[PDB]
Amino acid sequence: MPDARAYWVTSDLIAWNVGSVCLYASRAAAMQGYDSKVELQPESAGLPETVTQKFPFISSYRAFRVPSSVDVASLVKCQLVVASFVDVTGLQLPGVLDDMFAYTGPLGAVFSEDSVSLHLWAPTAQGVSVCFFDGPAGPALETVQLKESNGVWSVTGPREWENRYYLYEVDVYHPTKAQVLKCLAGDPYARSLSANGARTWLVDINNETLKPASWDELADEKPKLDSFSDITIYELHIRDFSAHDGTVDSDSRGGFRAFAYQASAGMEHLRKLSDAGLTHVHLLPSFHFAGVDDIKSNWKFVDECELATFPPGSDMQQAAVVAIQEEDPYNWGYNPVLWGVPKGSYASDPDGPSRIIEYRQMVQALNRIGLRVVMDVVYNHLDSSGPCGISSVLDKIVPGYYVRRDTNGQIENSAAMNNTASEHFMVDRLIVDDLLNWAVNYKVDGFRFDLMGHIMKRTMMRAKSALQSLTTDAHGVDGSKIYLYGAGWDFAEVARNQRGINGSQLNMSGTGIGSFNDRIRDAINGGNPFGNPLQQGFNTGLFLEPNGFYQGNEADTRRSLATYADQIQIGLAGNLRDYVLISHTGEAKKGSEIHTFDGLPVGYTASPIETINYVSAHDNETLFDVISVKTPMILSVDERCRINHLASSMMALSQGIPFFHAGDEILRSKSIDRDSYNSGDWFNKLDFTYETNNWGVGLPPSEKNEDNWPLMKPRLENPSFKPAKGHILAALDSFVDILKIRYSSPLFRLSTANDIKQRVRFHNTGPSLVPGVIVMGIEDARGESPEMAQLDTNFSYVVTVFNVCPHEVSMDIPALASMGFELHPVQVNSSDTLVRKSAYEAATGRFTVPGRTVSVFVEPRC
Ligand SMILES: OC[C@H]1O[C@H](O[C@H]2[C@H](O)[C@@H](O)[C@@H](O[C@H]3[C@H](O)[C@@H](O)[C@@H](O)O[C@@H]3CO)O[C@@H]2CO[C@H]2O[C@H](CO)[C@@H](O[C@H]3O[C@H](CO)[C@@H](O[C@H]4O[C@H](CO)[C@@H](O)[C@H](O)[C@H]4O)[C@H](O)[C@H]3O)[C@H](O)[C@H]2O)[C@H](O)[C@@H](O)[C@@H]1O
Numbered sequence: 052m053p054d055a056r057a058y059w060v061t062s063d064l065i066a067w068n069v070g071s072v073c074l075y076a077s078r079a080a081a082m083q084g085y086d087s088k089v090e091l092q093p094e095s096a097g098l099p100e101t102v103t104q105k106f107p108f109i110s111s112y113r114a115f116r117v118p119s120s121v122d123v124a125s126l127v128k129c130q131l132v133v134a135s136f137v138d139v140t141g142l143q144l145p146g147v148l149d150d151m152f153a154y155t156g157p158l159g160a161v162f163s164e165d166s167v168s169l170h171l172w173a174p175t176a177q178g179v180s181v182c183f184f185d186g187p188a189g190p191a192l193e194t195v196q197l198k199e200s201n202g203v204w205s206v207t208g209p210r211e212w213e214n215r216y217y218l219y220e221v222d223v224y225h226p227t228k229a230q231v232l233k234c235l236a237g238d239p240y241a242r243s244l245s246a247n248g249a250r251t252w253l254v255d256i257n258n259e260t261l262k263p264a265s266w267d268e269l270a271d272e273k274p275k276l277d278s279f280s281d282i283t284i285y286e287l288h289i290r291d292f293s294a295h296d297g298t299v300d301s302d303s304r305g306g307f308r309a310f311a312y313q314a315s316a317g318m319e320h321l322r323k324l325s326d327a328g329l330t331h332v333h334l335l336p337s338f339h340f341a342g343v344d345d346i347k348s349n350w351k352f353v354d355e356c357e358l359a360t361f362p363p364g365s366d367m368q369q370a371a372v373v374a375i376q377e378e379d380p381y382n383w384g385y386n387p388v389l390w391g392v393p394k395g396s397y398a399s400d401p402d403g404p405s406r407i408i409e410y411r412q413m414v415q416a417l418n419r420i421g422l423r424v425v426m427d428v429v430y431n432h433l434d435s436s437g438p439c440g441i442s443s444v445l446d447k448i449v450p451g452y453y454v455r456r457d458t459n460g461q462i463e464n465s466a467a468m469n470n471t472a473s474e475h476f477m478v479d480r481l482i483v484d485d486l487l488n489w490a491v492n493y494k495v496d497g498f499r500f501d502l503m504g505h506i507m508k509r510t511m512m513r514a515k516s517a518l519q520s521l522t523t524d525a526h527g528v529d530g531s532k533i534y535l536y537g538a539g540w541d542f543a544e545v546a547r548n549q550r551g552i553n554g555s556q557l558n559m560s561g562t563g564i565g566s567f568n569d570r571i572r573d574a575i576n577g578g579n580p581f582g583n584p585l586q587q588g589f590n591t592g593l594f595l596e597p598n599g600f601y602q603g604n605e606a607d608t609r610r611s612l613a614t615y616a617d618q619i620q621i622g623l624a625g626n627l628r629d630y631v632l633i634s635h636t637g638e639a640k641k642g643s644e645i646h647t648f649d650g651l652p653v654g655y656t657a658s659p660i661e662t663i664n665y666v667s668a669h670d671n672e673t674l675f676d677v678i679s680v681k682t683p684m685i686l687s688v689d690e691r692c693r694i695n696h697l698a699s700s701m702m703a704l705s706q707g708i709p710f711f712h713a714g715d716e717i718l719r720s721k722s723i724d725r726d727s728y729n730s731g732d733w734f735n736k737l738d739f740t741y742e743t744n745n746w747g748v749g750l751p752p753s754e755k756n757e758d759n760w761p762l763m764k765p766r767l768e769n770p771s772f773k774p775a776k777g778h779i780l781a782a783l784d785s786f787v788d789i790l791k792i793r794y795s796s797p798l799f800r801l802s803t804a805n806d807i808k809q810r811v812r813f814h815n816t817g818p819s820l821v822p823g824v825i826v827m828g829i830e831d832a833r834g835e836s837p838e839m840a841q842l843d844t845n846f847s848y849v850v851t852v853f854n855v856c857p858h859e860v861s862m863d864i865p866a867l868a869s870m871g872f873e874l875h876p877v878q879v880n881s882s883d884t885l886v887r888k889s890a891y892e893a894a895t896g897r898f899t900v901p902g903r904t905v906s907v908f909v910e911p912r913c
């Protein structure tokens with residue numbers, strides 16, 4: 052977009068950072084060449100507080116008054132410049148468009164008894180018509196003019212318009228082309244589409260033929276959720292789930308329908324996890340995104356049997372995958388086009404109703420096996436901008452409004468590309484309207500907000516209120532149980548609240564909305580995903596087992612290990628700002644007083660429900676891969692498997708909300724791909740036969756990985772690094788056991804900061820702490836005249852020992868001596884021979900824990 056350094060902030064005020072200012076307008080975009088010239092006098096009252104609160108980054112700008120004689124509604128449809136006498140620049144219009152034309156009425160389609168209405172917000176447009184098609188691929192049948200009122204274009208037609216397909220013909224000034232262009236655009240409020248969103252389907256989302264059997268009774272069948280503190284999350288990509296599952300019919304692999312195959316290997320796997328206690332599945336982007344063709348017959352994919360013949364450390368597999376990666380069935384989907392419609396490529400038929408019905412059937416099916424469904428929502432950026440292409444919708448209709456721009460008028464791209472501006476009224480409105488669409492129309496149980504730091508906190512909080520007030524009687528869903536969390540990363544143009552108070556980790560403290568705890572992730576794994584890949588952490592051999600490629604000294608690494616242990620313990624106690632820990636110096640510190648290496652407070656939340664504890668996710672290296680990179684090369688795969696289990700167990704037995712990447716439980720590899728978003732089914736394989744974990748399938752794609760190929764190649768080629776079926780199955784068995792343990796006692800899932808401060812203590816702390824061991828005790832009411840509520844009818848105390856040392860340790864804890872501790876019944880019965888050797892001795896309060904083991908001890912009541 053061109054140079055635009057001035058802002059039209061309200062109907063009567065323009066803001067521009069100058070030290071004789073005039074406004075020029077041309078309806079034909081001919082600019083000399085203007086239709087209208089207007090002198091702007093300096094406004095001695097300056098910018099109102101409402102303006103500076105909305106746009107903090109321009110609070111220093113001088114104010115200029117637009118005379119009340121000006122027809123603002125007409126001028127915003129023109130090419131506009133302001134001039135200072137000579138400096139000429141364009142005008143950024145969102146302020147005035149909101150001030151004059153903010154609209155809360157119906158958008159998209161409204162169905163009444165005898166009519167269908169369409170409304171489009173397009174306040175800068177010179178004309179809007181609707182072009183109707185009979186059929187998803189047929190020719191235009193008729194064009195109907197819409198009428199404008201206050202920036203909204205509308206038309207009401209007969210009920211027979213239902214199930215037509217349509218597009219809007221929008222005549223609008225596009226700054227990138229310096230022309231008024233006739234753009235063919237989909238409906239921002241679309242609820243279904245033809246293939247690839249080429250046209251919008253004029254569907255009544257409430258139509259009974261779009262509901263699976265018993266859909267209206269789904270609320271009655273949903274899994275009970277007593278508390279947000281009972282949540283565990285499993286993060287899964289829809290295509291990954293079934294792309295390689297031979298127990299699913301070829302036709303139904305990779306999409307929504309595979310979730311309706313009860314006895315498939317995949318659904319049996321999810322059943323196993325759900326029955327162990329898993330509560331929520333977080334599905335990667337499942338709305339209309341670009342980068343995958345909805346027409347399956349257009350897909351190109353490599354012969355996997357061919358690629359299997361190539362050497363494990365070769366660059367040939369990735370070259371083959373990359374050659375057709377833009378035309379294959381595969382993308383994570385963080386490329387938003389239209390938020391309110393299910394992705395067509397995941398439907399059996401991308402035209403008509405199947406994408407709606409099959410999405411609903413997926414939610415129903417997951418609910419019926421005991422899993423609530425979370426959507427990964429991506430409101431922070433758009434795939435495309437500008438007037439051209441099927442994949443640009445929002446910016447095609449109202450250019451320069453839905454996207455955030457810098458102070459020169461250029462689109463901000465920190466999110467990926469085409470950052471949105473949730474600070475603008477109709478963007479905020481669309482986001483919340485979309486969330487309510489998914490909650491009511493699809494009965495979705497929660498939302499993970501991609502780049503939540505790019506979203507205004509006021510949008511997050513309004514979304515929370517709107518969702519959690521939905522009721523079964525009025526909306527068919529219990530909104531009180533809908534859970535929100537997100538990745539509250541604070542960077543680029545939204546950092547330091549520059550565009551308003553944003554959804555950063557620190558800003559979302561005390562909101563009851565969760566955020567990913569990167570502190571526990573980095574302390575466990577070591578380093579960070581964008582630092583040195585060989586930097587070790589608490590669970591990857593720092594100090595105890597140096598890898599010999601990296602390091603510092605060993606008083607360095609001993610203290611570095613202890614520093615990481617402190618960070619982990621704060622996270623294990625819900626990552627609270629006010630939780631007090633005896634730190635490794637011996638000084639007692641609040642969680643917020645302990646800092647990361649970038650000076651960030653480690654603990655920042657006001658509640659465990661605000662913490663999403665993780666070591667792995669779709670981004671960056673899988674758990675198995677990060678362990679395989681960072682640990683000494685000489686470790687056996689058997690040892691690394693125990694290390695995998697330790698990491699996932701630290702999550703599963705933490706206070707807060709545990710988050711697992713799909714495949715944590717089965718040693719999933721991507722052959723060390725750090726960003727597999729476009730790396731195809733080959734690198735992203737999820738193998739529910741358990742025969743392979745996808746280690747050693749070639750060097751991963753060069754685009755994101757080539758700099759690290761030298762460390763990857765020898766490991767990928769080393770047969771000693773590759774697990775067998777037995778290892779994979781053992782990992783799954785111990786994973787399920789640890790989930791069962793979490794759900795065996797309410798003590799692991801405390802619901803408030805007060806409860807955690809009262810009940811949770813760590814017993815291996817201070818300057819003489821034993822390296823590589825964390826001991827965590829959780830107390831319940833005991834004796835007559837109890838001190839606290841009794842939460843657990845079975846156990847009066849639980850102790851977890853995490854031992855990352857390669858050798859057995861004995862921890863003597865006097866505070867826990869002379870008690871009735873025994874190994875947890877689940878671990879007494881474990882298929883793992885080692886954990887069964889764990890023991891407690893009352894005389895000394897001694898907990899004996901084998902090397903590379905997590906041992907859970909319980910004090911039974913009576
Ligand atoms: O945003 C681009 C960036 O995305 C990924 O980066 C992740 C990162 O891996 C993850 O760890 C975290 O980073 C934070 C870190 O964890 C914190 O400790 C702290 O240090 O702050 C960090 C953030 O500053 O989050 C990052 C963002 O991830 C999330 O957002 C992404 C955008 O929605 C999404 O990225 C995926 O999708 C995009 C779009 O398809 C894709 O981008 C490709 O295409 C773009 C053209 O549109 C082009 O500009 C990019 O250059 C190209 O890569 C990403 O590759 C793909 O991962 C995340 O999935 C979502 O969770 C990623 O790892 C980086 O490689 C990438 O540069």
Ligand SMILES: [Ca+2]
Pocket residue numbers: 342376377378379380381382729730731
């Ligand atoms: Ca692809």
